[PDB]
Every structure is written in C-alpha cells, then in structure tokens.
Amino acid sequence: TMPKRKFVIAFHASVNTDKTGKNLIKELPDLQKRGINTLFLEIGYNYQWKSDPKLYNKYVLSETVAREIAAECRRLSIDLIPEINCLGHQSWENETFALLKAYPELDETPGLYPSNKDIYCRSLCSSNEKVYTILFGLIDEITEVFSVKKIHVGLDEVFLIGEDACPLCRGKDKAELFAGAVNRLYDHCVKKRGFTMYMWGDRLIDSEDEDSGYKGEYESSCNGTYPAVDLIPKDIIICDWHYDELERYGSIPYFLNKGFRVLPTSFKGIKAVNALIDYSLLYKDNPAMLGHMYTAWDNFTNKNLSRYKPMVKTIDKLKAGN
C-alpha cells in the first residue's frame, strides 16, 4: 500500500576546532556501520573564513580539516549538511560571536543587554541588507568547502525581532519580519544556488497551542513569529526538535498538514528518544516524514558519538524502514 523506503537516519554534531573535527572523522566509519546515513554539522561562525576575513579566527575549524570531513562522508555515503544560524544564537552566555563582535551595528538590539544579561542570546537585524550580504557569502563559502548542495540556516534561538531598540524593525509585524528573512535566504540558497534548505521549526510553532506548542521547559519569550509558517516555501525542510517523553508530539502533524517535509530530532534519554521515534513511525507511510535526527546531549568533543546509547538502542527501528 506504499512503496518501501529508506529513512533519513541522521546525527547532529558540532565542530568548532580542528581537534573536534578530527574526533568526528575518527567516529564516521562506526556511525555509518550503526546505520547513520546523514550528518548535520553545526559550524556556526567557527570556520576560518576567507569571504569576510573579519570573521576569521585562527583557533576554529580549518579548510584542511573541513575538506577531510567532507571526503570521509563522501567515502561512507553519509549525506553532509552544514549548519549556520543565519539570524538567532549570535551569542552564548557573556560571549558574543564573530559576526556581532565585528559588526555591532548589525545587532537587532544594539546598545542593550550588556554581556547578554536578561536574554538567552542575541539576534541579527532581519531588515539590514549587510546581514544578508555577509551571510550569503558564508553560505557560499561553507558549502564549497564541504563540496555540498545543502544548507541548514538554523533560525532557532531568535528571541529578539522587531524590537523597539531597532530603528529598521521597530513596530513592524514579527511574522512578516521572520518570513522575510526565511524568504531572502531561500531566494539565495534555493532559487539561485540550487541547494536544498533546512531550518529549525521553533519560530513556526504557536507556543500557546496545547497540541503543537508547550515544548520548552519555560513559558518565557514572545510567540509572534508563528504565522510565518504560512508565508514561506513548503520545500524548506523543517527539523523539529523535541526533548520530552510523550505519547503524541503535535508539532509533527502540524508541519506535515501545512505541507512541509519534517525531520523529527531527539536529544537526551533512551525512553524519550524511543518515544519520539515510535510516534514518528505512526507516520511512516507519509513520505514527508523523512526519518529521525539524533543529538548527543552532553557531548562537546565528538568522541564516542557512535556509542551514544539512545541511538545504539533505537536505530534498528529506523533501519527497518517503512
């Protein structure tokens, strides 16, 4: 009653240095043997950029190691997708990342939140043309370094958008601002470059919807971007994170019924990971439910990723297919 198919069986890992890149390379054969066929590689700004040399840092991932990662993924038939957050997560704790350190004027809230106090993290201004000039150059560079035609543009961790402090965005509708950013990125990545574009679904969900929302452990933040879900192209692939153990994960049919392809993503805990996989397999006959993406909760080095117990104990459910 439906053609047999092979799921996306993905692992998310971050690389920010040559060392963490080499650690990952050592684990790739064992990941493939487990059944992983896809790697989402979070780079952010942690690459030795040539396109905008002001963002270069001598301690982050090199070109040489980056190309090695890509060559090992090609050899093993692992589909490699680099991830750069193109609007959110522009800082962490009291550290501001390379783009806003070099260009403070591209911040959505210039002059506010010293040391990022009272906010989770900073956002770029979604109306500033220079933001897109820089970002398109980084997307072009990182896809060429990894020799790929896929890109994950992030877009979670956007907590500041349409802020009173912003002279371009103040007063403006938050859903239109966010859809505008997505559509600018789509026009470059998909229309011009021909890539497949992925993003996180966080900002597309009504956090106050009892079925699809109430995800985070805190009712904090604003919930004004979600109507953008109806304003963006439906060939963008939505990675949909969960961390709880539930019998139903309502954001999955939410996105499927809005016409998107969805990649449910888990985190910590065998029981929670298994619960999300089992729920998603209720949709196994829907080709838009692409598979699963694992994340290794407390792993900052990439050592031993192929032995991550929630993956080891559940991946055979996905190797079985639909």
Q: What are the tokens at 20?
A: 């963490």
Does 155 participate in binding Zn ion (rule CB under 5 A)? Answer: no
The amino acid that residue 119 corresponds to is I
Does 39 participate in binding Zn ion (rule CB under 5 A)? Answer: no
Residue 169 binds which entry of Na ion, Zn ion, none, with Cβ cut-offs from 5 to 8 Å by kind?
Zn ion
Cβ distance to Zn ion smaller for residue 12 or 261: 12
Residue 121 binds which entry of Zn ion, Na ion, none, with Cβ cut-offs from 5 to 8 Å by kind?
Zn ion
**Angle at 88 (CA atoms; ends 83, 94), nearest 5 degrees:** 110
Cβ distance to Zn ion smaller for residue 172 or 234: 172
**Residue found under tokens 């397999």:** 281
User: What is the C-alpha separation between 132 and 319, in angstroms, rounded?
Assistant: 39
Contact residues: Na ion, CB under 5 A: 14, 16, 42, 44, 46, 67, 70, 147
Residue 157 binds which entry of Zn ion, Na ion, none, with Cβ cut-offs from 5 to 8 Å by kind?
Zn ion
Residue with nearest beta carbon to Na ion:
147
**Residue found under tokens 């304003």:** 231
Number of CB atoms found within 10 A of residue 40's CB = 24
- From 26-34, 73-81, 166-174, 258-266, span contacting Zn ion (CB under 5 A): 166-174
Task: Write out the binding residues for Zn ion, residues 76-115 only, by CB under 5 A.
Answer: 89, 108
3-class DSSP state for residue 45?
coil
Beta carbon of residue 291, minimum distance to Na ion (angstroms, whole number): 23
Cβ distance to Na ion smaller for residue 64 or 147: 147
189, 152 contact by CB (below 8 A): no
Cβ distance to Zn ion smaller for residue 127 or 314: 127
Task: Write out the binding residues for Zn ion, residues 214-243 only, by CB under 5 A.
Answer: none
**Angle at 215 (CA atoms; ends 311, 296), nearest 5 degrees:** 25
Cβ distance to Zn ion smaller for residue 27 or 202: 202
**Angle at 217 (CA atoms; ends 212, 220), nearest 5 degrees:** 90
Cβ distance to Zn ion smaller for residue 107 or 206: 107
Does 202 participate in binding Zn ion (rule CB under 5 A)? Answer: no
Half-sphere exposure of residue 123: CA atoms within 13 angstroms, side-chain side: 27
Does 169 participate in binding Zn ion (rule CB under 5 A)? Answer: yes
Q: Where do the DSSP E strands lie in 85-195?
A: 91-92, 95-96, 150-152
Beta carbon of residue 60, minimum distance to Na ion (angstroms, whole number): 8
Number of CB atoms found within 10 A of residue 2's CB = 9
Residue 44 binds which entry of Na ion, Zn ion, none, with Cβ cut-offs from 5 to 8 Å by kind?
Na ion
Sites of contact with Zn ion (CB under 5 A): 89, 108, 121, 125, 127, 157, 166, 168-169
